[PDB]
PDB file of all heavy atoms in Angstrom:
ATOM      1  N   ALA A   1     138.202  40.112  70.393  1.00 21.59           N
ATOM      2  CA  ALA A   1     138.702  41.491  70.331  1.00 21.59           C
ATOM      3  C   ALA A   1     137.939  42.463  71.275  1.00 21.59           C
ATOM      4  O   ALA A   1     137.906  43.667  71.017  1.00 21.59           O
ATOM      5  CB  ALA A   1     138.665  41.994  68.897  1.00 21.59           C
ATOM      6  N   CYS A   2     137.373  41.953  72.373  1.00 19.25           N
ATOM      7  CA  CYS A   2     136.649  42.812  73.324  1.00 19.25           C
ATOM      8  C   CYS A   2     137.582  43.684  74.193  1.00 19.25           C
ATOM      9  O   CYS A   2     137.081  44.555  74.909  1.00 19.25           O
ATOM     10  CB  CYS A   2     135.701  41.988  74.188  1.00 19.25           C
ATOM     11  SG  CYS A   2     136.541  41.016  75.466  1.00 19.25           S
ATOM     12  N   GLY A   3     138.900  43.422  74.158  1.00 15.54           N
ATOM     13  CA  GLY A   3     139.890  44.171  74.928  1.00 15.54           C
ATOM     14  C   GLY A   3     140.071  43.717  76.370  1.00 15.54           C
ATOM     15  O   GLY A   3     140.546  44.494  77.198  1.00 15.54           O
ATOM     16  N   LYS A   4     139.705  42.460  76.698  1.00 15.42           N
ATOM     17  CA  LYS A   4     139.837  41.948  78.065  1.00 15.42           C
ATOM     18  C   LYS A   4     141.279  41.809  78.559  1.00 15.42           C
ATOM     19  O   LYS A   4     141.533  42.057  79.743  1.00 15.42           O
ATOM     20  CB  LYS A   4     139.086  40.619  78.231  1.00 15.42           C
ATOM     21  CG  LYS A   4     139.442  39.540  77.233  1.00 15.42           C
ATOM     22  CD  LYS A   4     138.444  38.385  77.296  1.00 15.42           C
ATOM     23  CE  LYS A   4     138.773  37.328  76.264  1.00 15.42           C
ATOM     24  NZ  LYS A   4     137.877  36.145  76.355  1.00 15.42           N
ATOM     25  N   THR A   5     142.227  41.400  77.667  1.00 18.05           N
ATOM     26  CA  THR A   5     143.640  41.218  78.008  1.00 18.05           C
ATOM     27  C   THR A   5     144.255  42.573  78.323  1.00 18.05           C
ATOM     28  O   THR A   5     144.889  42.722  79.363  1.00 18.05           O
ATOM     29  CB  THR A   5     144.411  40.452  76.894  1.00 18.05           C
ATOM     30  OG1 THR A   5     143.800  39.173  76.704  1.00 18.05           O
ATOM     31  CG2 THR A   5     145.897  40.287  77.200  1.00 18.05           C
ATOM     32  N   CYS A   6     143.989  43.576  77.489  1.00 16.84           N
ATOM     33  CA  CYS A   6     144.471  44.926  77.761  1.00 16.84           C
ATOM     34  C   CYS A   6     143.946  45.482  79.090  1.00 16.84           C
ATOM     35  O   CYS A   6     144.729  46.069  79.826  1.00 16.84           O
ATOM     36  CB  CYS A   6     144.181  45.861  76.597  1.00 16.84           C
ATOM     37  SG  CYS A   6     145.083  45.426  75.084  1.00 16.84           S
ATOM     38  N   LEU A   7     142.674  45.228  79.439  1.00 16.07           N
ATOM     39  CA  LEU A   7     142.086  45.694  80.694  1.00 16.07           C
ATOM     40  C   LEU A   7     142.836  45.094  81.922  1.00 16.07           C
ATOM     41  O   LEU A   7     143.258  45.848  82.808  1.00 16.07           O
ATOM     42  CB  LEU A   7     140.567  45.398  80.729  1.00 16.07           C
ATOM     43  CG  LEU A   7     139.821  45.823  82.004  1.00 16.07           C
ATOM     44  CD1 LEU A   7     139.941  47.325  82.241  1.00 16.07           C
ATOM     45  CD2 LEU A   7     138.359  45.408  81.958  1.00 16.07           C
ATOM     46  N   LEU A   8     143.059  43.756  81.928  1.00 14.99           N
ATOM     47  CA  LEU A   8     143.810  43.072  82.990  1.00 14.99           C
ATOM     48  C   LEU A   8     145.263  43.574  83.105  1.00 14.99           C
ATOM     49  O   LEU A   8     145.747  43.781  84.216  1.00 14.99           O
ATOM     50  CB  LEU A   8     143.822  41.544  82.759  1.00 14.99           C
ATOM     51  CG  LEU A   8     142.487  40.842  82.984  1.00 14.99           C
ATOM     52  CD1 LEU A   8     142.539  39.406  82.555  1.00 14.99           C
ATOM     53  CD2 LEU A   8     142.017  40.988  84.442  1.00 14.99           C
ATOM     54  N   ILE A   9     145.943  43.789  81.977  1.00 17.67           N
ATOM     55  CA  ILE A   9     147.331  44.280  81.973  1.00 17.67           C
ATOM     56  C   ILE A   9     147.415  45.685  82.588  1.00 17.67           C
ATOM     57  O   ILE A   9     148.268  45.943  83.435  1.00 17.67           O
ATOM     58  CB  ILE A   9     147.921  44.253  80.527  1.00 17.67           C
ATOM     59  CG1 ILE A   9     148.152  42.814  80.037  1.00 17.67           C
ATOM     60  CG2 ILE A   9     149.212  45.098  80.398  1.00 17.67           C
ATOM     61  CD1 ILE A   9     148.342  42.742  78.485  1.00 17.67           C
ATOM     62  N   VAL A  10     146.559  46.593  82.136  1.00 19.87           N
ATOM     63  CA  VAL A  10     146.548  47.976  82.599  1.00 19.87           C
ATOM     64  C   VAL A  10     146.251  48.086  84.109  1.00 19.87           C
ATOM     65  O   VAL A  10     146.890  48.881  84.788  1.00 19.87           O
ATOM     66  CB  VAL A  10     145.592  48.816  81.725  1.00 19.87           C
ATOM     67  CG1 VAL A  10     145.312  50.179  82.349  1.00 19.87           C
ATOM     68  CG2 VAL A  10     146.156  48.969  80.311  1.00 19.87           C
ATOM     69  N   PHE A  11     145.346  47.253  84.639  1.00 18.51           N
ATOM     70  CA  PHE A  11     145.042  47.286  86.069  1.00 18.51           C
ATOM     71  C   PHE A  11     146.194  46.703  86.895  1.00 18.51           C
ATOM     72  O   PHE A  11     146.544  47.284  87.921  1.00 18.51           O
ATOM     73  CB  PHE A  11     143.742  46.528  86.378  1.00 18.51           C
ATOM     74  CG  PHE A  11     143.434  46.461  87.856  1.00 18.51           C
ATOM     75  CD1 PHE A  11     143.019  47.590  88.546  1.00 18.51           C
ATOM     76  CD2 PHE A  11     143.521  45.261  88.545  1.00 18.51           C
ATOM     77  CE1 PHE A  11     142.769  47.534  89.910  1.00 18.51           C
ATOM     78  CE2 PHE A  11     143.263  45.208  89.907  1.00 18.51           C
ATOM     79  CZ  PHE A  11     142.890  46.344  90.582  1.00 18.51           C
ATOM     80  N   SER A  12     146.737  45.535  86.481  1.00 18.06           N
ATOM     81  CA  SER A  12     147.798  44.835  87.201  1.00 18.06           C
ATOM     82  C   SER A  12     149.114  45.614  87.193  1.00 18.06           C
ATOM     83  O   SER A  12     149.799  45.645  88.210  1.00 18.06           O
ATOM     84  CB  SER A  12     147.987  43.425  86.652  1.00 18.06           C
ATOM     85  OG  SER A  12     148.433  43.428  85.305  1.00 18.06           O
ATOM     86  N   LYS A  13     149.456  46.255  86.074  1.00 20.00           N
ATOM     87  CA  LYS A  13     150.649  47.100  86.025  1.00 20.00           C
ATOM     88  C   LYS A  13     150.390  48.461  86.701  1.00 20.00           C
ATOM     89  O   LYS A  13     151.311  49.050  87.238  1.00 20.00           O
ATOM     90  CB  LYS A  13     151.108  47.307  84.579  1.00 20.00           C
ATOM     91  CG  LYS A  13     151.698  46.059  83.941  1.00 20.00           C
ATOM     92  CD  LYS A  13     152.108  46.321  82.498  1.00 20.00           C
ATOM     93  CE  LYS A  13     153.230  45.420  82.053  1.00 20.00           C
ATOM     94  NZ  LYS A  13     154.568  45.990  82.391  1.00 20.00           N
ATOM     95  N   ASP A  14     149.123  48.928  86.697  1.00 16.37           N
ATOM     96  CA  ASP A  14     148.583  50.198  87.208  1.00 16.37           C
ATOM     97  C   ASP A  14     148.959  51.373  86.290  1.00 16.37           C
ATOM     98  O   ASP A  14     149.189  52.490  86.760  1.00 16.37           O
ATOM     99  CB  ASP A  14     148.911  50.474  88.691  1.00 16.37           C
ATOM    100  CG  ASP A  14     147.945  51.450  89.351  1.00 16.37           C
ATOM    101  OD1 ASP A  14     146.813  51.609  88.833  1.00 16.37           O
ATOM    102  OD2 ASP A  14     148.328  52.070  90.379  1.00 16.37           O
ATOM    103  N   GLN A  15     148.986  51.104  84.970  1.00 13.33           N
ATOM    104  CA  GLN A  15     149.293  52.080  83.926  1.00 13.33           C
ATOM    105  C   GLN A  15     149.200  51.428  82.534  1.00 13.33           C
ATOM    106  O   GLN A  15     149.181  50.193  82.437  1.00 13.33           O
ATOM    107  CB  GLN A  15     150.691  52.727  84.144  1.00 13.33           C
ATOM    108  CG  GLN A  15     151.899  51.923  83.654  1.00 13.33           C
ATOM    109  CD  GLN A  15     152.856  52.835  82.929  1.00 13.33           C
ATOM    110  OE1 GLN A  15     154.073  52.858  83.190  1.00 13.33           O
ATOM    111  NE2 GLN A  15     152.328  53.633  82.005  1.00 13.33           N
ATOM    112  N   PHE A  16     149.144  52.248  81.457  1.00 16.88           N
ATOM    113  CA  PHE A  16     149.122  51.697  80.103  1.00 16.88           C
ATOM    114  C   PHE A  16     150.580  51.537  79.683  1.00 16.88           C
ATOM    115  O   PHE A  16     151.276  52.547  79.566  1.00 16.88           O
ATOM    116  CB  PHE A  16     148.366  52.612  79.113  1.00 16.88           C
ATOM    117  CG  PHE A  16     148.184  51.969  77.755  1.00 16.88           C
ATOM    118  CD1 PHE A  16     147.237  50.973  77.561  1.00 16.88           C
ATOM    119  CD2 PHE A  16     148.995  52.317  76.687  1.00 16.88           C
ATOM    120  CE1 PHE A  16     147.079  50.366  76.321  1.00 16.88           C
ATOM    121  CE2 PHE A  16     148.843  51.699  75.445  1.00 16.88           C
ATOM    122  CZ  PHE A  16     147.879  50.732  75.271  1.00 16.88           C
ATOM    123  N   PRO A  17     151.064  50.277  79.525  1.00 14.92           N
ATOM    124  CA  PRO A  17     152.481  50.048  79.146  1.00 14.92           C
ATOM    125  C   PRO A  17     152.959  50.866  77.947  1.00 14.92           C
ATOM    126  O   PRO A  17     152.347  50.825  76.886  1.00 14.92           O
ATOM    127  CB  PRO A  17     152.533  48.545  78.852  1.00 14.92           C
ATOM    128  CG  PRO A  17     151.078  48.116  78.716  1.00 14.92           C
ATOM    129  CD  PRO A  17     150.325  49.009  79.636  1.00 14.92           C
ATOM    130  N   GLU A  18     154.035  51.639  78.134  1.00 12.29           N
ATOM    131  CA  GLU A  18     154.522  52.552  77.107  1.00 12.29           C
ATOM    132  C   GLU A  18     155.493  51.963  76.095  1.00 12.29           C
ATOM    133  O   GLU A  18     155.525  52.418  74.955  1.00 12.29           O
ATOM    134  CB  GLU A  18     155.158  53.785  77.767  1.00 12.29           C
ATOM    135  CG  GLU A  18     154.176  54.588  78.608  1.00 12.29           C
ATOM    136  CD  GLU A  18     154.780  55.290  79.813  1.00 12.29           C
ATOM    137  OE1 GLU A  18     156.029  55.285  79.943  1.00 12.29           O
ATOM    138  OE2 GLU A  18     154.004  55.840  80.629  1.00 12.29           O
ATOM    139  N   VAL A  19     156.315  51.003  76.506  1.00 13.11           N
ATOM    140  CA  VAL A  19     157.321  50.421  75.623  1.00 13.11           C
ATOM    141  C   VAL A  19     156.794  49.219  74.840  1.00 13.11           C
ATOM    142  O   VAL A  19     157.099  49.089  73.660  1.00 13.11           O
ATOM    143  CB  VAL A  19     158.602  50.097  76.424  1.00 13.11           C
ATOM    144  CG1 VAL A  19     159.649  49.407  75.563  1.00 13.11           C
ATOM    145  CG2 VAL A  19     159.174  51.359  77.043  1.00 13.11           C
ATOM    146  N   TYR A  20     155.992  48.359  75.474  1.00 11.50           N
ATOM    147  CA  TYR A  20     155.478  47.163  74.812  1.00 11.50           C
ATOM    148  C   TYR A  20     154.212  46.701  75.507  1.00 11.50           C
ATOM    149  O   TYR A  20     154.203  46.610  76.732  1.00 11.50           O
ATOM    150  CB  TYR A  20     156.534  46.046  74.883  1.00 11.50           C
ATOM    151  CG  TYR A  20     156.076  44.699  74.354  1.00 11.50           C
ATOM    152  CD1 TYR A  20     155.929  44.478  72.991  1.00 11.50           C
ATOM    153  CD2 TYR A  20     155.839  43.635  75.215  1.00 11.50           C
ATOM    154  CE1 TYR A  20     155.509  43.251  72.500  1.00 11.50           C
ATOM    155  CE2 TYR A  20     155.436  42.392  74.731  1.00 11.50           C
ATOM    156  CZ  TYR A  20     155.293  42.201  73.369  1.00 11.50           C
ATOM    157  OH  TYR A  20     154.886  40.994  72.866  1.00 11.50           O
ATOM    158  N   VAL A  21     153.147  46.392  74.745  1.00 12.22           N
ATOM    159  CA  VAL A  21     151.924  45.879  75.338  1.00 12.22           C
ATOM    160  C   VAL A  21     151.993  44.357  75.173  1.00 12.22           C
ATOM    161  O   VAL A  21     152.086  43.876  74.046  1.00 12.22           O
ATOM    162  CB  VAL A  21     150.623  46.453  74.681  1.00 12.22           C
ATOM    163  CG1 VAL A  21     149.370  45.873  75.348  1.00 12.22           C
ATOM    164  CG2 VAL A  21     150.596  47.985  74.724  1.00 12.22           C
ATOM    165  N   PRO A  22     151.984  43.587  76.269  1.00 10.36           N
ATOM    166  CA  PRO A  22     152.050  42.113  76.131  1.00 10.36           C
ATOM    167  C   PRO A  22     150.868  41.506  75.362  1.00 10.36           C
ATOM    168  O   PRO A  22     149.763  42.031  75.365  1.00 10.36           O
ATOM    169  CB  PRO A  22     152.077  41.613  77.583  1.00 10.36           C
ATOM    170  CG  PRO A  22     152.512  42.827  78.401  1.00 10.36           C
ATOM    171  CD  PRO A  22     151.931  44.004  77.685  1.00 10.36           C
ATOM    172  N   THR A  23     151.139  40.427  74.657  1.00 11.51           N
ATOM    173  CA  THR A  23     150.149  39.680  73.897  1.00 11.51           C
ATOM    174  C   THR A  23     149.240  38.906  74.844  1.00 11.51           C
ATOM    175  O   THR A  23     148.046  38.739  74.568  1.00 11.51           O
ATOM    176  CB  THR A  23     150.863  38.650  72.971  1.00 11.51           C
ATOM    177  OG1 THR A  23     151.989  39.252  72.313  1.00 11.51           O
ATOM    178  CG2 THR A  23     149.906  38.011  71.963  1.00 11.51           C
ATOM    179  N   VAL A  24     149.821  38.353  75.930  1.00 11.29           N
ATOM    180  CA  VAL A  24     149.043  37.527  76.829  1.00 11.29           C
ATOM    181  C   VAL A  24     149.161  37.966  78.287  1.00 11.29           C
ATOM    182  O   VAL A  24     150.104  38.674  78.677  1.00 11.29           O
ATOM    183  CB  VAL A  24     149.399  36.012  76.640  1.00 11.29           C
ATOM    184  CG1 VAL A  24     149.251  35.568  75.183  1.00 11.29           C
ATOM    185  CG2 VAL A  24     150.793  35.702  77.186  1.00 11.29           C
ATOM    186  N   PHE A  25     148.211  37.499  79.092  1.00 10.53           N
ATOM    187  CA  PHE A  25     148.156  37.734  80.522  1.00 10.53           C
ATOM    188  C   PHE A  25     148.157  36.333  81.180  1.00 10.53           C
ATOM    189  O   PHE A  25     147.350  35.487  80.781  1.00 10.53           O
ATOM    190  CB  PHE A  25     146.869  38.512  80.847  1.00 10.53           C
ATOM    191  CG  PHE A  25     146.648  38.774  82.314  1.00 10.53           C
ATOM    192  CD1 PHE A  25     147.302  39.816  82.956  1.00 10.53           C
ATOM    193  CD2 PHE A  25     145.789  37.974  83.054  1.00 10.53           C
ATOM    194  CE1 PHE A  25     147.090  40.058  84.305  1.00 10.53           C
ATOM    195  CE2 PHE A  25     145.604  38.200  84.408  1.00 10.53           C
ATOM    196  CZ  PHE A  25     146.247  39.247  85.024  1.00 10.53           C
ATOM    197  N   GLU A  26     149.075  36.072  82.131  1.00 10.49           N
ATOM    198  CA  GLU A  26     149.159  34.767  82.807  1.00 10.49           C
ATOM    199  C   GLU A  26     148.134  34.716  83.969  1.00 10.49           C
ATOM    200  O   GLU A  26     147.092  34.094  83.843  1.00 10.49           O
ATOM    201  CB  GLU A  26     150.626  34.484  83.269  1.00 10.49           C
ATOM    202  CG  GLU A  26     151.628  34.454  82.133  1.00 10.49           C
ATOM    203  CD  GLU A  26     153.017  34.953  82.493  1.00 10.49           C
ATOM    204  OE1 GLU A  26     153.119  36.092  83.009  1.00 10.49           O
ATOM    205  OE2 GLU A  26     154.003  34.216  82.249  1.00 10.49           O
ATOM    206  N   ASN A  27     148.428  35.399  85.082  1.00  9.48           N
ATOM    207  CA  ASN A  27     147.531  35.617  86.215  1.00  9.48           C
ATOM    208  C   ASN A  27     148.121  36.761  87.063  1.00  9.48           C
ATOM    209  O   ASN A  27     149.242  37.226  86.801  1.00  9.48           O
ATOM    210  CB  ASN A  27     147.211  34.337  87.042  1.00  9.48           C
ATOM    211  CG  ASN A  27     148.326  33.905  87.969  1.00  9.48           C
ATOM    212  OD1 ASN A  27     149.486  34.280  87.778  1.00  9.48           O
ATOM    213  ND2 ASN A  27     148.004  33.089  88.985  1.00  9.48           N
ATOM    214  N   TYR A  28     147.393  37.186  88.089  1.00 12.19           N
ATOM    215  CA  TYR A  28     147.833  38.234  88.981  1.00 12.19           C
ATOM    216  C   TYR A  28     146.969  38.189  90.261  1.00 12.19           C
ATOM    217  O   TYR A  28     145.811  37.805  90.191  1.00 12.19           O
ATOM    218  CB  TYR A  28     147.699  39.600  88.276  1.00 12.19           C
ATOM    219  CG  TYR A  28     148.381  40.717  89.022  1.00 12.19           C
ATOM    220  CD1 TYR A  28     149.747  40.921  88.907  1.00 12.19           C
ATOM    221  CD2 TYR A  28     147.661  41.562  89.861  1.00 12.19           C
ATOM    222  CE1 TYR A  28     150.387  41.933  89.622  1.00 12.19           C
ATOM    223  CE2 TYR A  28     148.288  42.573  90.579  1.00 12.19           C
ATOM    224  CZ  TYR A  28     149.651  42.747  90.467  1.00 12.19           C
ATOM    225  OH  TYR A  28     150.272  43.752  91.168  1.00 12.19           O
ATOM    226  N   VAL A  29     147.536  38.522  91.428  1.00 13.07           N
ATOM    227  CA  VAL A  29     146.777  38.571  92.670  1.00 13.07           C
ATOM    228  C   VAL A  29     146.842  40.004  93.169  1.00 13.07           C
ATOM    229  O   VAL A  29     147.887  40.426  93.658  1.00 13.07           O
ATOM    230  CB  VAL A  29     147.257  37.563  93.735  1.00 13.07           C
ATOM    231  CG1 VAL A  29     146.493  37.773  95.056  1.00 13.07           C
ATOM    232  CG2 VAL A  29     147.081  36.135  93.227  1.00 13.07           C
ATOM    233  N   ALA A  30     145.767  40.780  92.972  1.00 13.11           N
ATOM    234  CA  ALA A  30     145.758  42.184  93.354  1.00 13.11           C
ATOM    235  C   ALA A  30     145.444  42.395  94.836  1.00 13.11           C
ATOM    236  O   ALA A  30     144.566  41.720  95.370  1.00 13.11           O
ATOM    237  CB  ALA A  30     144.752  42.945  92.502  1.00 13.11           C
ATOM    238  N   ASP A  31     146.144  43.332  95.488  1.00 17.13           N
ATOM    239  CA  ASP A  31     145.836  43.674  96.873  1.00 17.13           C
ATOM    240  C   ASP A  31     144.926  44.878  96.786  1.00 17.13           C
ATOM    241  O   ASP A  31     145.368  45.951  96.367  1.00 17.13           O
ATOM    242  CB  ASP A  31     147.103  44.005  97.652  1.00 17.13           C
ATOM    243  CG  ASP A  31     147.914  42.760  97.926  1.00 17.13           C
ATOM    244  OD1 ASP A  31     147.345  41.784  98.479  1.00 17.13           O
ATOM    245  OD2 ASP A  31     149.108  42.747  97.569  1.00 17.13           O
ATOM    246  N   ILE A  32     143.651  44.706  97.137  1.00 13.68           N
ATOM    247  CA  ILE A  32     142.654  45.770  97.026  1.00 13.68           C
ATOM    248  C   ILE A  32     142.000  46.070  98.367  1.00 13.68           C
ATOM    249  O   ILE A  32     141.759  45.146  99.146  1.00 13.68           O
ATOM    250  CB  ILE A  32     141.568  45.332  95.994  1.00 13.68           C
ATOM    251  CG1 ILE A  32     142.150  45.206  94.588  1.00 13.68           C
ATOM    252  CG2 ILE A  32     140.340  46.263  95.996  1.00 13.68           C
ATOM    253  CD1 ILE A  32     141.328  44.451  93.699  1.00 13.68           C
ATOM    254  N   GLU A  33     141.721  47.343  98.652  1.00 13.93           N
ATOM    255  CA  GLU A  33     140.988  47.709  99.849  1.00 13.93           C
ATOM    256  C   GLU A  33     139.757  48.484  99.404  1.00 13.93           C
ATOM    257  O   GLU A  33     139.885  49.605  98.903  1.00 13.93           O
ATOM    258  CB  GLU A  33     141.824  48.521 100.844  1.00 13.93           C
ATOM    259  CG  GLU A  33     141.103  48.670 102.177  1.00 13.93           C
ATOM    260  CD  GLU A  33     141.978  48.895 103.395  1.00 13.93           C
ATOM    261  OE1 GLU A  33     142.790  49.850 103.377  1.00 13.93           O
ATOM    262  OE2 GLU A  33     141.854  48.118 104.370  1.00 13.93           O
ATOM    263  N   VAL A  34     138.580  47.874  99.529  1.00 13.25           N
ATOM    264  CA  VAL A  34     137.362  48.537  99.111  1.00 13.25           C
ATOM    265  C   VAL A  34     136.365  48.611 100.270  1.00 13.25           C
ATOM    266  O   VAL A  34     136.142  47.610 100.970  1.00 13.25           O
ATOM    267  CB  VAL A  34     136.780  47.945  97.814  1.00 13.25           C
ATOM    268  CG1 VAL A  34     136.154  46.577  98.047  1.00 13.25           C
ATOM    269  CG2 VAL A  34     135.773  48.902  97.183  1.00 13.25           C
ATOM    270  N   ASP A  35     135.859  49.833 100.533  1.00 13.44           N
ATOM    271  CA  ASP A  35     134.913  50.134 101.593  1.00 13.44           C
ATOM    272  C   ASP A  35     135.392  49.627 102.986  1.00 13.44           C
ATOM    273  O   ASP A  35     134.596  49.179 103.800  1.00 13.44           O
ATOM    274  CB  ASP A  35     133.511  49.638 101.215  1.00 13.44           C
ATOM    275  CG  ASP A  35     132.987  50.295  99.938  1.00 13.44           C
ATOM    276  OD1 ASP A  35     133.061  51.537  99.839  1.00 13.44           O
ATOM    277  OD2 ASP A  35     132.499  49.565  99.043  1.00 13.44           O
ATOM    278  N   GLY A  36     136.689  49.735 103.237  1.00 16.41           N
ATOM    279  CA  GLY A  36     137.268  49.313 104.503  1.00 16.41           C
ATOM    280  C   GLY A  36     137.637  47.843 104.583  1.00 16.41           C
ATOM    281  O   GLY A  36     138.105  47.408 105.629  1.00 16.41           O
ATOM    282  N   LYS A  37     137.418  47.055 103.512  1.00 15.14           N
ATOM    283  CA  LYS A  37     137.720  45.619 103.544  1.00 15.14           C
ATOM    284  C   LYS A  37     138.904  45.273 102.663  1.00 15.14           C
ATOM    285  O   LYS A  37     138.943  45.670 101.500  1.00 15.14           O
ATOM    286  CB  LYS A  37     136.506  44.777 103.119  1.00 15.14           C
ATOM    287  CG  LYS A  37     135.280  44.941 104.024  1.00 15.14           C
ATOM    288  CD  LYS A  37     134.005  44.361 103.387  1.00 15.14           C
ATOM    289  CE  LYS A  37     132.968  43.957 104.430  1.00 15.14           C
ATOM    290  NZ  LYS A  37     132.150  42.769 104.012  1.00 15.14           N
ATOM    291  N   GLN A  38     139.866  44.514 103.214  1.00 15.92           N
ATOM    292  CA  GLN A  38     141.064  44.091 102.489  1.00 15.92           C
ATOM    293  C   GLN A  38     140.840  42.752 101.801  1.00 15.92           C
ATOM    294  O   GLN A  38     140.470  41.776 102.452  1.00 15.92           O
ATOM    295  CB  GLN A  38     142.258  43.992 103.440  1.00 15.92           C
ATOM    296  CG  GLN A  38     143.219  45.168 103.340  1.00 15.92           C
ATOM    297  CD  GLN A  38     144.028  45.136 102.068  1.00 15.92           C
ATOM    298  OE1 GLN A  38     144.302  44.074 101.500  1.00 15.92           O
ATOM    299  NE2 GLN A  38     144.443  46.303 101.601  1.00 15.92           N
ATOM    300  N   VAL A  39     141.045  42.705 100.469  1.00 18.83           N
ATOM    301  CA  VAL A  39     140.838  41.502  99.674  1.00 18.83           C
ATOM    302  C   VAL A  39     142.041  41.202  98.770  1.00 18.83           C
ATOM    303  O   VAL A  39     142.626  42.121  98.199  1.00 18.83           O
ATOM    304  CB  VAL A  39     139.557  41.684  98.804  1.00 18.83           C
ATOM    305  CG1 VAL A  39     139.424  40.591  97.736  1.00 18.83           C
ATOM    306  CG2 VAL A  39     138.295  41.770  99.654  1.00 18.83           C
ATOM    307  N   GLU A  40     142.370  39.907  98.592  1.00 21.44           N
ATOM    308  CA  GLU A  40     143.340  39.447  97.625  1.00 21.44           C
ATOM    309  C   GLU A  40     142.479  39.008  96.425  1.00 21.44           C
ATOM    310  O   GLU A  40     141.723  38.034  96.541  1.00 21.44           O
ATOM    311  CB  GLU A  40     144.119  38.233  98.162  1.00 21.44           C
ATOM    312  CG  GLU A  40     145.276  38.584  99.067  1.00 21.44           C
ATOM    313  CD  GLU A  40     146.314  37.480  99.169  1.00 21.44           C
ATOM    314  OE1 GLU A  40     145.953  36.292  98.979  1.00 21.44           O
ATOM    315  OE2 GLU A  40     147.498  37.809  99.412  1.00 21.44           O
ATOM    316  N   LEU A  41     142.514  39.747  95.325  1.00 20.74           N
ATOM    317  CA  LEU A  41     141.694  39.419  94.147  1.00 20.74           C
ATOM    318  C   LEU A  41     142.552  38.733  93.050  1.00 20.74           C
ATOM    319  O   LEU A  41     143.378  39.398  92.399  1.00 20.74           O
ATOM    320  CB  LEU A  41     141.055  40.697  93.581  1.00 20.74           C
ATOM    321  CG  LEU A  41     139.969  40.521  92.503  1.00 20.74           C
ATOM    322  CD1 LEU A  41     138.680  39.905  93.097  1.00 20.74           C
ATOM    323  CD2 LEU A  41     139.639  41.872  91.822  1.00 20.74           C
ATOM    324  N   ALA A  42     142.360  37.414  92.846  1.00 24.47           N
ATOM    325  CA  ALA A  42     143.090  36.710  91.792  1.00 24.47           C
ATOM    326  C   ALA A  42     142.395  37.027  90.473  1.00 24.47           C
ATOM    327  O   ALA A  42     141.170  36.953  90.386  1.00 24.47           O
ATOM    328  CB  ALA A  42     143.085  35.222  92.049  1.00 24.47           C
TER     329      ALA A  42
END
């Protein structure tokens, strides 16, 4: 119950789901640009 699934869902969707919060998270590949560097973060 540390809230890890909710943290991954909220970042990957880029918002707190309003209609339904999923029970599980499968995977996701985020496109992130930090300090001028482009990374694919699985």
Side-chain angles (χ1 to χ4, degrees):
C2 75
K4 54 192 178 176
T5 301
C6 295
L7 179 60
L8 289 172
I9 290 164
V10 167
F11 176 72
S12 64
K13 289 179 153 273
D14 203 21
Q15 82 136 130
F16 187 76
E18 298 148 8
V19 176
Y20 174 74
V21 180
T23 316
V24 306
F25 177 81
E26 300 147 306
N27 77 339
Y28 191 81
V29 175
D31 288 307
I32 295 163
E33 190 155 55
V34 73
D35 300 311
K37 299 166 155 213
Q38 258 287 332
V39 168
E40 277 201 334
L41 190 69

